[PDB]
Amino acid sequence: VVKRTQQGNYVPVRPDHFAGVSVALFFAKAGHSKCAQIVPVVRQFYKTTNFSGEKAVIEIIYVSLDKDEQDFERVRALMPWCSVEYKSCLRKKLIERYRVPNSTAIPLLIVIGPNGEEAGRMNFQQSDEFVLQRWDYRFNKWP
């Protein structure tokens, strides 16, 4: 259901990767103005905070609300983190359970506790962009 993007093919990720870190679900579109705005700033933040030091510290599962295989793959191929499978029913399950309306609700960062629920909520549709540094992982990491 969850797919780790690497060089050459796509590999299932072990559930031991998510352990000891903070995992954020990233609700996004493809080709939307704010979506294309928020992809690269988050990519830079992710790169700097994971490569700064030894240990991986955060992990973001990207979840789409796209309408096309090609669009999903296009928006997914330019990101360093894992994603969720387009055909998996988990994606629509996540949508219905977290109540994104499918707009001002995009993009969204919901950081998640060990029980798969809302450990913390964060919206980008606002002038501020220090919210990337504001989300801190030292306070909500899984065992």
Binding site: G113, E118, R134, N140
Partner: protein
């Protein structure tokens, strides 16, 4: 064991108190349903199959906030009877909430209080959260404070009132309700802690750098304060102080019990972890006016008493060191007649956090409840607002129409004058 009853009156009382019960349920590891997967007995009862119910009552005349809790996530966490609702709002009229519509709901309120206090003897006292500027907050707040004072006369009643702010009001008839409630909580409550709405807006702006807050950010900070006051009751500590010894160390005269609040540190998620929360500087980050939670500059006041409650990795050596450097630091002034003006309380349990909320974990924290003579400005400024109203009887006809006698404005005015004079006298 020995428990405390929390009472919420009015809109602000409901909303502030719900953040309090979010924090208390979280730190004791009990679920929204109310069952965990004897330290918690100070805030939760037992109920049959290992489920815990709070010692709180929710009171409001309009249903629009208390009905919403009943349909919220914590629907089974509270007793159905403990959330009491009317049909019509008090509507910013202290006269209405005290005389007409107050009597039909006060009875239902003190029935549940009677039942919840008679569960065990040797309970500490009462915590009351209310809005001064509001209708039911001031109206029904006085009615319970009056009738609890005659029945449970001996025991302690602590008040955490959302006092109206200097510039910010979001109301117009609020000077009337302020001076009317002040006459009614001078001689019926024991310790009153004054809270300011726009002072905490200042706190969230410079310390925490939230340029764009909301009420959910307000009530989280209040919940951290209330937990710090009652931390000594729940968890084991090096040197505990209870709610009984609050009025002993902070109330020198029976009239003078209006005292400010402060918390430190109020620090962000990214901001905190890169700097020493030293015990020395955690108090230096408490005595400055900008950290004080009332918008009331104490530089032109004199400190009468002070009570500090530390929480977490705190040792007795650093507490005595931090007190000594403050007393010798010049910018604050102590009153001549009170040499031993400090009372230290140390608790072992670290501050808990609401995850993905606003604040962070810090290894130690301090909460301040300090009595000073700075309060003279906030009553004089409220008096200046009231004299303009009363100069030509504006918004009086609503008050007098229900059944409140005209002239209670006059006598409450001179009481606040009597309260103003006492504060000026004691600060010599």
């Amino acid at each position: 064991m020995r428990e405390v009853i929390s009472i919420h009156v009015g809109q602000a009382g409901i909303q502030i108190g719900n953040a309090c019960w979010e924090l208390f349920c979280l730190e004791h590891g009990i679920q929204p349903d109310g069952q965990m997967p004897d330290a918690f007995n100070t805030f939760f009862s037992e109920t049959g199959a290992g489920k815990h119910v709070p010692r709180c009552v929710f009171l409001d005349l309009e249903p629009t906030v208390v009905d919403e809790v009943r349909t919220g996530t914590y629907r089974h966490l509270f007793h159905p009877e403990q959330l009491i609702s009317g049909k019509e709002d008090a509507a910013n009229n202290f006269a209405r909430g005290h005389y007409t519509i107050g009597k039909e709901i006060v009875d239902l309120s003190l029935d549940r209080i009677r039942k919840l206090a008679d569960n065990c003897t040797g309970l500490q006292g009462f915590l009351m959260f209310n809005a001064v500027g509001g209708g039911t907050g001031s109206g029904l707040g006085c009615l319970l404070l009056e009738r609890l004072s005659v029945d449970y006369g001996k025991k302690s009643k602590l008040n955490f009132c959302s006092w109206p702010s200097p510039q910010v009001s979001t109301a117009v008839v609020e000077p009337y309700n302020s001076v009317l409630s002040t006459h009614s909580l001078l001689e019926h409550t024991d310790v009153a802690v004054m809270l300011d709405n726009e002072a905490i807006y200042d706190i969230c702006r410079r310390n925490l750098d939230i340029e764009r807050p909301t009420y959910t950010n307000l009530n989280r900070l209040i919940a951290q304060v209330i937990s710090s006051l009652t931390a000594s009751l729940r968890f084991d500590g090096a040197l505990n102080v209870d709610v009984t010894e609050f009025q002993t160390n902070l109330v020198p005269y029976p009239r003078i019990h209006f005292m400010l609040s402060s918390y430190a540190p109020i620090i962000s998620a990214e901001k905190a972890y890169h700097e020493q929360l030293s015990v020395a500087e955690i108090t230096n980050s408490a005595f400055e006016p900008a950290s004080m939670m009332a918008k009331c500059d104490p530089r032109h006041g004199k400190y009468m008493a002070c009570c500090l409650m530390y929480r977490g990795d705190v040792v007795p050596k650093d507490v005595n060191a931090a007190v000594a450097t403050i007393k010798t630091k010049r910018t604050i002034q102590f009153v001549d007649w009170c040499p031993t003006g400090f009372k230290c309380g140390i608790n072992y349990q670290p501050p808990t956090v609401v995850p993905g909320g606003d604040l962070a974990k810090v290894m130690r924290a301090v909460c301040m409840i300090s009595n000073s003579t700075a309060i003279a400005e906030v009553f004089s400024r409220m008096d200046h607002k009231f004299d303009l109203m009363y100069a030509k009887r504006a918004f009086v006809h609503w008050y007098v129409g229900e059944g409140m006698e005209e002239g209670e404005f006059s006598e409450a005015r001179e009481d606040l004058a009597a309260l103003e004079k006492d504060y000026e006298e004691v600060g010599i």
